[PDB]
Design a binder for this molecule. Structure first.
Ligand SMILES: Nc1ncnc2c1ncn2[C@@H]1O[C@H](COP(=O)(O)OP(=O)(O)OP(O)(O)=S)[C@@H](O)[C@H]1O
Ligand SMILES: Nc1ncnc2c1ncn2[C@@H]1O[C@H](COP(=O)(O)OP(=O)(O)OP(O)(O)=S)[C@@H](O)[C@H]1O
Ligand code: NA
Ligand code: NA
Lengths: 323, 323
């Protein structure tokens, strides 16, 4: 039943400046700035695409192993994930580098100053999926999430060699990879996940037609924001599922990851394509409506009720029957 | 024998950008910047003036209690200090705020973008020194380090009420406090510590003469950078001690704190003024020569040797006799 989730593990450190950055950005000092901002809030969110996906699968009660690279400062995050049933045995802990980190300071005018530190993520290229197989047997599915790029290639190649089904889930790496690199991530995938902007980017960079892609994969999953999700099979069957209506948009971060987790959890639990997309749509809206990416709650009763509103009582009952 | 060290507890998170900030600071977007820097190094240093001083006193084998406010993220820092003999029982742990943090990103041209987050430091005003006294009896000395400003006043006032000797150690808060506020921190001090710029600032903001200050305190300690330290008593005795010559200046951060720790450790161990200043000068140079503020080692043999080079074998023997 085990899904192995590969990809980035990171935290976001968000700081608020009550002033305006522009007050310190006069031309006299742009050649060598020395900016200092007294900030009045610091929020830390657990993230990375693999952390987000593993967290969600765990919360939903799926069998899941997180496979990525982090630093010694990962310990409290490990305990957090382990509390939700995530197997973290195969998280590579760097001896020298800290866990990847996004830091962002935002002022009162919503100007931002941001950095990204890859840290230990770069060591994901040293993880061998064979070591996972030795400990837990062959995963039912390996998710190839956004990561150290070399690690994405090596993991995908190892999946093919070892006969492991994989999901191509390159998300924000599509912009950075060459057309050939993207083809190499997609050939033979059990699933391809993207949003609709990324789907178009994929076709233009690779030079593939849609038919060429569908000759390579078992299922295309293309998210459409508020317009739902398209699922396309290589036989020409298409399924479209609408969203669960939201009651707020407190933070859109992590929504794609959440969709994927819910969908794949549904598939692993034996649900059909429509029902799995419905489940993914619920998890996605819970993440949309909450701060950060792993700060949402899972309430069986509220899930059943909300699913029934969006998709009818019959569909809701079919879905919660497996949770 | 117990020194209670009040003041800031913080960490420094330092990130390196291999590029130039100026490349993203064209006039077209200064009104609402969205800067993004891919950084390639992150170094975290344990600090705060009270943390630095307590660490040093502990390493030297003194009896010391750290009294300041931090967040739940203080745990690994607690264990670090406890390993060196620091009593952390009276560190107030915030339920909502993180430990104070300085974050700084530096580019290849040594331009910097920095923030300071006070966090839990602001809750130091809720610490009661009476609670320390109840647990450990009256400290021999309470250091009033740079801190939440209200906490500095409240701690000093509590010392007078409770009959506890205190060291006025306002350092970088002198620039921010009013002349009256500074007088209120200094009246009745057993010790006043500053550097020489701060000594002049103190006299000009307060309107005191040197004689007026010396009528208020038992000892003035004024550090002079590479020119050593002056110690002045209210009877008109003055002692000047030169530095221990350095072999590098890898990082000047934390040097004042280190001097204070070594000096006060010497005083608590029964050393005279000259010898205590000699000990403080050694600890100061060890911190000057090391990255960060608590990343230096303590080697009894190398200390004796280095002290003898600077001050002669007799003085070196008198000093290490108490370590
Ligand atoms: N406004 C919305 N209301 C309800 N559901 C939504 C909304 N936006 C997105 N979703 C659900 O979230 C899924 C993924 O959203 P997308 O916006 O296509 O993902 P994405 O671009 O990868 O988002 P990020 O970058 O992870 S926030 C959709 O297929 C929907 O099921
Ligand atoms: N270049 C040096 N060589 C040897 N010892 C030094 C040197 N600079 C400082 N010291 C010692 O460090 C003590 C304190 O240094 P100062 O520079 O006066 O302190 P400060 O201005 O509080 O420094 P910071 O801000 O804590 S780095 C001096 O009294 C010396 O004993
Ligand atoms: Na969110
Ligand atoms: Na230093």
């Amino acid at each position: 039943m085990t899904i192995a989730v590969t990809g980035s593990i990171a935290t976001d450190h968000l700081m608020r400046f009550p002033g305006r950055f522009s007050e310190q950005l006069l031309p006299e000092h742009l050649h060598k700035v020395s900016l200092s901002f007294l900030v009045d809030d610091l929020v830390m969110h657990r993230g990375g695409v693999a952390g987000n996906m593993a967290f969600a699968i765990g919360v939903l009660g799926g069998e899941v192993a997180l496979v990525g690279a982090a630093g010694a400062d990962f310990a409290d995050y490990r305990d957090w994930l382990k509390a939700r049933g995530v197997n973290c045995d195969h998280v590579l802990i760097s001896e020298t580098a800290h866990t990847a980190r996004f830091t962002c300071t935002t002022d009162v005018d919503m100007a931002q100053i941001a950095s990204f530190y890859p840290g230990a993520m770069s060591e994901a290229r040293n993880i061998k999926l064979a070591d996972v197989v030795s400990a837990i047997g062959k995963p039912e599915l390996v998710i190839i999430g956004a990561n150290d790029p070399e690690a994405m290639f090596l993991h995908t190649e190892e999946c093919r060699k070892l006969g492991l089904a994989f999901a191509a889930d390159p998300s924000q790496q599509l912009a950075r990879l060459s057309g050939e690199e993207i083809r190499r991530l997609v050939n033979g995938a059990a699933y391809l996940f993207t949003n609709d902007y990324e789907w178009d980017l994929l076709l233009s960079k690779t030079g593939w037609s849609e038919a060429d892609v569908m000759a390579q994969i078992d299922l295309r999953v293309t998210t459409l924001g508020p317009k739902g999700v398209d699922l396309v099979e290589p036989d020409g069957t298409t399924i479209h599922v609408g969203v669960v209506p939201e009651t707020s948009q407190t933070d859109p971060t992590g929504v794609g990851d959440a969709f994927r987790a819910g969908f794949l959890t549904g598939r692993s639990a034996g649900l059909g394509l429509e029902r799995s997309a419905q489940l993914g749509s619920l998890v996605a809206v819970l993440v949309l409506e909450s701060t950060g990416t792993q700060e949402w709650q899972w309430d069986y009763e509220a899930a059943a009720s909300r699913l029934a509103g969006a998709y009818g009582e019959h569909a809701a009952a079919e879905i919660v029957a497996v949770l």
